[PDB]
Symmetry: C3
């Protein structure tokens, strides 16, 4: 693997390889002894747009591997208004570092960068169209907590129309077997039809549901995403929507599923669900570190 630009670039087997590697990274972390796997290696964080979350996780992952990190987070005026084009910055930075995590608004930005970069490019959103690492950690969470990915019944709740990370996860799962999908959302925010077509073609068993109550307790994974306010300018109607799709304790009690949420969690899930056994989004967050560790390590070693 030369770069990690989009989930579209890797198959089931290669995904499972990355997951195995992540399980190993997790054990290493459990060791509490200093790891030197990437000692002497430098990760360059290159963000034209902000993402404290993305930066922290990758920075943690790299440092857990004994590696170093240089950071470049503002380029909305630090070089985009300073003149330097993307391809110039990439070239300068691939000369400094050993690997780059890039978050750039322009479409195909990460792909172009990989073309001019002498080091591996990791795409952390362009500007948030394809986020492979988020999708990999989601899959990792499922494997860890459920045992394996094939044969799961997963339900997605929230804005399925603009949920980029849902989109990415949905596609990735279509590469697996016997996966039943449930798409719960406001009628206004249903999964993009083109995707629906992809699922139908791949002959995936799926359902579009209007309500959370339309779900039986056969679902193995509840993956909840955000429903932003920009979708309902009227505070009154927005109350309605939030109320209908907010995950609450009473609805969770005695359920089989685990609950996943890419974070941050704002309104989607009540605070008194956090302490329920099925709540796993914070554990999910942690899993993000071992899989980013595997990703970092793999890209370094695959290319030298």
């Amino acid at each position: 693997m030369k770069h990690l630009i989009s989930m579209k670039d890797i198959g089931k087997e290669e995904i499972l390889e990355i997951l195995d590697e992540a399980r190993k990274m997790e054990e290493l972390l459990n060791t509490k002894r200093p790891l030197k796997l990437l000692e002497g290696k430098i990760l360059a964080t290159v963000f034209y747009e902000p993402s404290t979350r993305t930066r922290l996780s990758f920075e943690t992952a790299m440092k857990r591997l004994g590696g170093e990190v240089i950071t470049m987070t503002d380029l909305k005026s630090s070089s985009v208004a300073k003149g330097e084009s993307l391809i110039d910055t990439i070239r300068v930075i691939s000369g400094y570092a050993d690997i780059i995590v890039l978050r750039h608004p322009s479409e195909g930005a990460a792909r172009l960068a990989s073309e001019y970069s002498q080091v591996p490019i990791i795409n952390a959103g362009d500007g948030s169209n394809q986020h492979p690492t988020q999708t990999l950690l989601d899959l990792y969470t499922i494997m860890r907590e459920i045992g394996r990915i094939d044969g799961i019944k997963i339900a997605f709740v929230g804005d399925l129309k603009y949920g980029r990370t849902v989109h990415s996860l949905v596609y990735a799962l279509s590469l697996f077997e016997n996966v039943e999908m449930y798409f719960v959302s406001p009628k206004e925010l249903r999964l993009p039809k083109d995707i629906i077509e992809d699922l139908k073609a791949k002959n995936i068993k799926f359902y579009e549901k209007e309500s959370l109550d339309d779900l039986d307790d056969d679902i193995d994974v509840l993956y909840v995403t955000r429903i932003q306010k920009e979708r309902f300018p009227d505070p009154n109607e927005y109350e309605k929507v939030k109320g209908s799709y907010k995950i609450k304790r009473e609805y969770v009690e005695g359920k089989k599923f685990i609950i996943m949420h890419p974070l941050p969690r704002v309104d989607e899930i009540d605070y008194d669900v956090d302490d329920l056994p099925q709540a796993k989004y914070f554990k999910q967050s942690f899993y993000g570190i071992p899989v980013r560790m595997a990703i970092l390590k793999k890209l370094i070693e695959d290319n030298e």
Copy 2:
């Protein structure tokens, strides 16, 4: 010690333990050989409010111990306006790191955080009510330079009414023996009465003084704090105040005391005092590193 939230949580003995540990850290630094005490450990700097000073010192302390540091300084809009509540951020970050230094405006913020954190919380101001580490380094300075803390005559000059760090130091000293306190300030900015009550109860010998000249040369330590402009909107009157309480060379010459100042120094002390023997605030600054080292180390090791 699980966390370090407030000086109110530790007694004389435990303070002295921390100080001994700091003396050891200082020797280690004097060695100029790479220290690995916290190799493989990650410190997370979590500030909703800015504090370049706080961040640098802790970051230096952690790195001197061979440890790593991840930084999160803006949360006034990076997650407070991004939606994520404090308790969520703490949970995500305690999953990434091994220890956290937190500076959050809300009262009892650090305490709440420690409740949701799986790792030790260090309170670097909430929003600047209790700063244990500053108070510990102040005490360390006194022990190092004076020999011991008991039996000192210390005078505080400046705004004693809003001097949070004076407040914290004053309380901590009340735990020691034979400590005589002198409180020099504008009548408008005298030490809060409730504190005065605490001192009277603890039967501490203390004096409220109007002028610097009311001090004899029996004082062992001169601890000076800031008198902000917000206290005297009239530039004319503010001239008067500054002039009356500014420490000047001629007043310092031949004095027994050392001069402590938490920094930054703006108007409180003339520049031509810096080079006088009794000037110790810059040495005080350095001492901040060894005691933060001890603090970091202790909290890691006490909890694993």
Copy 3:
């Protein structure tokens, strides 16, 4: 060498020493094995003004040497409006760190700092009058790519009147032998006369040229700098200027010279020159790391 404040402070021999040291650093980098030369040492980046470029390179250099880095980039209001004077910050930071890279707008800022600093000061622009490290890496590039510095024919294109880095390089080269200089620029932006005097005095063979076509193919090095818009408010005339001095592929083909550019490259050089053999500015960028490594190492070791 106690500090590195200005090129005016070091002679040919000492420059060559630093260059040799840089060649060694470059080999070490080529090794791809973790270097520990500055393990346990802390570099403090102190910028009152912004310079993502400067910071990254030095930070990379220090980390390549196994060292650590603390960063302080905003002081336009973080301590300049927070009260603390430069000399105070320097003293606090020289207590924390082992070496400082300083970028401060005020003239003679770096020099003053070195006076109050207990650790070596590296001047990264004050506010951009003397940048020794840029000038050292430029010289390094020439030695590496040309073989040696003496006897080269170098042409400078762009704004020669406000090109601080050209000024610095020109002076440094005057310390070498048989160096022929060609100064290509708009008549409005010719090399400052006082410098011309220095060259005449040192009896350097040089020419002031109006056009790129006035250059023969005997030039060994083409060093191009920026011509900002502030020099030609009329977009119309600015078109003219840019067009006349922009380096283009057809002009470069079959040329003997290498092309150097301190970066960032905005308008000065066409993108389809990048891939021509004579294009070396990105390699030049990389060379910046080994020479900053040598600089960092030398200053640490010369002072302990």
